[PDB]
Amino acid sequence: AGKKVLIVYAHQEPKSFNGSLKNVAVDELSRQGCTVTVSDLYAMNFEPRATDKDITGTLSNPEVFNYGVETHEAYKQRSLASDITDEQKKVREADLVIFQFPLYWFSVPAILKGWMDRVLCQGFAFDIPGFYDSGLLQGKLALLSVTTGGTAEMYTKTGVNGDSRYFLWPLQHGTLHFCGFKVLAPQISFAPEIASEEERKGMVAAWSQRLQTIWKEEPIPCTAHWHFGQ
Amino acid sequence: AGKKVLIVYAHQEPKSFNGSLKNVAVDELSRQGCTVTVSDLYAMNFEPRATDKDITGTLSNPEVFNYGVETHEAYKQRSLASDITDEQKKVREADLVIFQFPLYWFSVPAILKGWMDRVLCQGFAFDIPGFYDSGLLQGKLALLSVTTGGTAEMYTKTGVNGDSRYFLWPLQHGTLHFCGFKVLAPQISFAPEIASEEERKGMVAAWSQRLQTIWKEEPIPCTAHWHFGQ
Ligand SMILES: Cc1cc2nc3c(=O)[nH]c(=O)nc-3n(C[C@H](O)[C@H](O)[C@H](O)COP(=O)(O)OP(=O)(O)OC[C@H]3O[C@@H](n4cnc5c(N)ncnc54)[C@H](O)[C@@H]3O)c2cc1C
Ligand SMILES: Cc1cc2nc3c(=O)[nH]c(=O)nc-3n(C[C@H](O)[C@H](O)[C@H](O)COP(=O)(O)OP(=O)(O)OC[C@H]3O[C@@H](n4cnc5c(N)ncnc54)[C@H](O)[C@@H]3O)c2cc1C
Ligand SMILES: Brc1c(Br)c(Br)c2[nH]cnc2c1Br
Ligand SMILES: Brc1c(Br)c(Br)c2[nH]cnc2c1Br
Ligand SMILES: [Zn+2]
Ligand SMILES: [Zn+2]
């Protein structure tokens, strides 16, 4: 019936190819009757830095600042900064989290890295126990929709950049799998800037068309073998 | 004789293990007579977000903002924000760039990711063509000094996190190699929080010790095979 979707979106420009991918996702999921929420990081001027400002009140140890320990305690004592808890609420309510971003240095743009660093704290996303298959967000789906400057050719095992699955590893496995997400196959839109309209539209349509049956999909086996083998 | 080093340092707490590893680097490189500079990113409140504030001149396309295009042109024109060019000057003068950071989500902390996103712009760090072995920072060395929460065993091929080299790919190859750096072998200090006081002191001294002969080192072959195996 009614699945809830959070789109975490990281692009500066509404007219961008990333913006269109985000908008057709909102459009198509909305059409299906899904509950949809968008975190527009640049528009929110989202704070990427992990600092002691992320804890309100009294630090667990104001002499030596340990971010990980202090945020773990602030979570369990409900004293995290509100920009963080706002995002955790959106994530708690979502059944599927889509990340929409241009590839920046084989990874996410820093503003989105900061979202991962600050929002996915211990207590909330992971714990002992509860990581990988049993991470605290199990039951949820996650999907990386990434756009690139480099063509698909460049992202082959014999290409200069190596297989795109190589750079996926820290995101899909080290971050998403670690928190208990089932990981849906990445959506990779290769090299929009150098493409035609026929190809570009094609890529947007693939995405829109894929979203039509997203709820029927099987997760990938988020394994070293999936990423590095064959 | 006259080597110049830049340490790009990303930890909030001077008394931290990262702080100590950064201080022993400065101590030992300074002892050797090297020229040493540190960018203490949190202390500088370094801006991680790639935004249109990074360009102060007339935009090449004011209607649709394209960060990579606008910063490339701004670099040529000299209309980049001055925090960016301050860093570029440090890099340009360095013979060796050391990155000192705790592993955050199989990667660098967002404030450091932002340094990479914003500082290594087209025209300065790379060109098209002019990347990988043709990168503009060719002739320079780079080295990742990483600390982890995870133990070394967790970071092996058969361990839960996979081999440590797997997560190095986006950083060593996708970023440093792409810009033309030769990459020295990573320094990874595993699980200092778990370690005994003696093991901690030893890990610090192992780093100091290595630094005594850093200038005699050859780089790694920064290739898929090195990172992933056969
Ligand atoms: C700091 C930095 C680091 C980077 N690192 C990497 C890297 O490691 N690897 C890599 O491969 N690339 C890298 N890039 C390149 C970057 O990933 C690409 O520039 C980015 O993915 C392009 O996506 P976009 O949404 O910004 O494209 P846009 O320029 O915004 O859009 C492409 C074109 O599509 C058009 N368009 C918009 N909407 C539609 C629509 N609905 N239908 C048809 N056309 C439409 C736009 O008008 C535009 O002309 C990096 C770039 C930067 C700035
Ligand atoms: C957002 C986030 C994401 C993370 N993601 C990952 C991840 O993906 N993978 C992973 O493995 N880990 C991860 N971690 C854990 C993180 O990498 C470790 O907490 C970090 O590497 C520890 O380094 P530190 O400098 O902060 O240790 P500290 O806590 O500062 O140091 C540990 C101990 O060393 C002591 N010490 C300091 N100086 C000396 C000295 N000179 N001699 C002896 N002892 C000394 C300190 O006092 C302290 O007791 C993450 C943490 C956070 C907050
Ligand atoms: Br493959 C690659 C590409 Br194609 C681009 Br445009 C880029 N811009 C900044 N870093 C990069 C990389 Br690593
Ligand atoms: Br060991 C470890 C790992 Br392996 C990850 Br992926 C992580 N994310 C936040 N903290 C951590 C730790 Br402490
Ligand atoms: Zn996995
Ligand atoms: Zn390489």
Structure write-up:
The structure is a homodimer of 230-residue chains. Chain A has 230 residues and is α/β, with parallel strands linked by helices. Chain A has a single domain, classed as Rossmann fold. Helix content of chain A is 35%, strand content 14%. Chain A is built from seven helices and six strands. In chain A, strands 1, 2, 3, 4, 5 and 6 form a six-stranded parallel beta sheet that branches. In chain A, helix 1 (17-31) runs parallel beside helix 6. One flavin-adenine dinucleotide sits between chains A (11, 13, 16-18, 20, 102-106, 147-150, 192-193, 197, 200-201, 204) and B (50, 64, 66-68, 117, 174). The PDB classes it as oxidoreductase/inhibitor. The entry lists the keywords quinone reductase 2, CK2 inhibitor, Oxidoreductase-Inhibitor complex. It forms a dimeric assembly.
Oligomer: homodimer
Radius of gyration of chain A: 18 Å
How many discrete structural domains of chain A? 1
So how many helices of chain A? 7
Ligands (ions, cofactors included) = flavin-adenine dinucleotide, 4,5,6,7-tetrabromo-benzimidazole, zinc ion
Q: How widely separated are the two ends of chain A?
A: 38 Å
Biggest interface, chains and residues, is: A-B, 47 and 49 residues
What would the keywords be for this entry?
phosphoprotein (chains A, B), NAD(P)H_dehydrogenase_qn (chains A, B), zinc ion binding (chains A, B), 7 helices, metal-binding (chains A, B), binds 4,5,6,7-tetrabromo-benzimidazole, chloride ion binding (chains A, B), globular, Rossmann fold, homodimer, alpha/beta, 6 strands, 230 residues
